[model samples]
Target chain A: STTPINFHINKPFVFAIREKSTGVILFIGEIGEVKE
Target chain B: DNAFAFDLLQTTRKHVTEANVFISPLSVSMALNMTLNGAAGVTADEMKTALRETGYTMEDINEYSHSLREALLKVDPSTTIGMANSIWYKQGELVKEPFILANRTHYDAEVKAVDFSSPATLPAINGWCAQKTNDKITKILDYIPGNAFMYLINAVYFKGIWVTQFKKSDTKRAPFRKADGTTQEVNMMAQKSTFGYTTDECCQYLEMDYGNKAFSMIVMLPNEGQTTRDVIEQLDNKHWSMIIKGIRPTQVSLRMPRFKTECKYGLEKKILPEMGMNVPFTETADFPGITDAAIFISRVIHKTFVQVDEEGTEAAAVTAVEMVK
Candidate 1:
């Protein structure tokens, strides 16, 4: 039988990546990694 | 045995070239093999050929895998090798009974059904990965993809103390030459011991045992001016086994960088098919046991972390196999 299990999730986090040579930000990924 | 492991690693290096690469072949293989339990027909034949070079049956693989995990568990009390498997399927999806039972019997996997439509589902899966790897790998699934109906996951965590631990005082800042011939300051751990050592024209090898000599950190330093690629190209199952068996006890003064690295991989999209397992990811796929409905592998995400310091090493990895219908 397919049963649904109840669960809780936490808040999201924001992180960025930068290029060392120019000190410029390249990308930012928000916390869909947690639960968008 | 180890041939398949090396084959998988070599394939990984092909697509992820010119960079530091780290993966748990053990973790990926476990999760994939668990999925193989439910595979049938051409899908099964293709996966066998793709993974182990067509020498193993599912029965053979399952029996040997059971013994391997059992052997690992009994290896050393001080060392920790935590392995966990779990399956999350959409609520109300009719999964095969044998598939669930076989995994639970062999792998001690936890089977659960959850509403994949809920926002909370993804985190719970990621949370399990984090908990299994001691939070070293906090996330494996960024977000549950649309149409994804099932996820099979395996997490492996290993921590072992050196049999002859390096003294913290002996660690010092030293110059490490990068692959590009650039030098930088790095924490270098130094030690002198009678280690299992071997050498060829290509490189020098050292085997440092961990916890009752059950496992070891094997290091290969390429000959000056030789690249990692040069050493890796020469490493096949036969060649690697010969090098391992040829290791002899010798007193050596060793100095190595204290380093750590983490990485994530999307194997299904990038590497596995390139290694000869293509049918499983295509529209013509047939994994009937998983579901008779039109289903195929969506993504295989593998994340790994490794840290080497003065005392010992701690490494962890998790692999998630996502199926979409």
Candidate 2:
């Protein structure tokens, strides 16, 4: 079944922190969201 | 909705088709975006009416997005082409990693600048196409847009390892069927498969398994008489999806010829007639509900690049490559 899809996703900004050579993604901050 | 948005989303999924696709960064930021609003772009609502043209609007799209992001964070690895893009809570706020998937560029400019992280708007892809393959055809990122967080502006990068490595010994000129049905010598690499298969239509099928859980790549080799372009032209999206679904647990070993190919495409021009999606990703598309009646898809930016190899890792980096995406 298809989960409810959302289009206002902003993952691009955060991805900048992950180092390419090591492949480690660091979680930065949290704000109130409405989808889930 | 618009050519740029649709094409970029379509291009993003190519990474999954070609390699071990990963979205660890996307997964986290998506969590944050969800908290902001239920970001709804396409497929959120379908209009079906002659009395009135039912349509999709970026209503309180953020409301629903947050809900789903919260849920996806708890689930474990998946069986299908699993992907997640979200914002994670860091420092008491929804902060996520920063990467290429969210490049902030324009979508319709023939060419643009993408400083790696700037979202690849429609124009960005055009520039990307020219540089990546040296302007082969101009398709920067074109694939599926499943919960990519950079809805405001983003890009999708896809890369994969060649199934067969080109060996100087096996490389040779073979007769290749031309568009006119003629023959020309082309480089070929002979190979084989254990769980060999062919469709009722006579086209051969092959499999590329990644790790466990029956997750693998299902490749359909066109009949010798069929051309690659023709095969794609006659492709069945539904059939292809179902084919992947039908791939029950099975082991496959394949032998195929090594070959190299690269192309650039502009789905905007192609999909205009293909999907009949007219007027959605525009500044004046009447979508004055997303923000203070001043907000719209605004600027869409997308850029994608990926590499798949023996180590078996596929990476995609996108930025709001949005245009009513």
Candidate 3:
């Protein structure tokens, strides 16, 4: 069974980079706006 | 390491508002960890506190970091990753042999003796940075000051293709709502697939894997009426750990913008001191293990570049710590 989810990153959000094996984060950032 | 990363992220967020913020905490840590090898007295203690590795010995930290770097390189075959370190000391400087040996043994740092007065030294150092990052980062130094005696640099490069890449044809111009209530039309890459997904009161979490499930990008989109700041303030290592544990594979429809951004920060002046690492930047700093000369950290410049698109993500970072007498 799969739960359906809708995720639209239209506004400000946070992001992070991780290594799956050790679960250590490499990088992290925030996007306040989408700038061209 | 995660604690340091989150703390730095939170601190950086407080200062840089209304802009896309990206940083490589690992790169900064690698450079500082090398420097920590030489730190002594209160300076070492403060750095340990700031780095959140208070109980661990310098050897323990180095060994762990060494293994961590090794594991990351071999984890994903399809992903291209590079981690490089270098130390350039002024010619005739009598840097201790023990400090040099420790870094070379654990961090595999390239040690060079260069005359800071030479005109070509700047480009030579910057060139190493550029080569290590695959040209994503070209210049990590503008000018090598006359008083600067040593530079410890770390560079990280990553290029990973998405396991489920967004179709280029599906990408279209869409309106993105900014924090200021303004709207910008940007390229939104759309994808619908089974991904690690979860949600809480504050935001929707999605984990998109890259290169054989070894590395991933986790995106947290704030819920309606919530802001990015809300998520940042609410998130700490414990909350983040719970969030990762709660994630389950689910059908997700994700709309993410394709963007490129870069940032340059002189952290020694403001961020490091605010984080309780003040002595290293002051004249009273003590790093007797590194050299007999009276010196202290003069600058710590960190720069990063990141681009996310329909194909994948390309990111690079370089951190340079300058020592001056």
lDDT scores in order: 0.71, 0.30, 0.89
DockQ of each: 0.01, 0.03, 0.75
lDDT of 3 by residue, B1-325 (tens): 3888888888777776547789999999999999999999998998888778899999899999899899988999899889899999999989999999999988899999999988899999999999998888999998888899899999999998998999989999999887778899999999988899888888889999998989999999888888888787777889898889999988888889998888888888778877889888888889998998889999999999888999889999999999999
Q: Tens digits of per-residue lDDT for model 2 on B132-154?
A: 23232355345324322223322
lDDT winner between candidates 1 and 3? 3
- The regions of model 1 sitting more than 4 angstroms off are A1-36
**Candidate 1 chain B lDDT trough over 10 residues, lowest sum:** B175-184
- Candidate 3, residue B130: Cα displacement in angstroms equals 0.8
Q: Native contact fraction of candidate 1?
A: 0.00
Clash list (residue pairs), candidate 3: none
The TM-score values for the models, in the order shown, are: 0.88, 0.42, 0.97
Winning candidate number (TM-score): 3
Off by over 4 Å in 2: A1-36, B1-193, B227-234, B241-276, B293-325
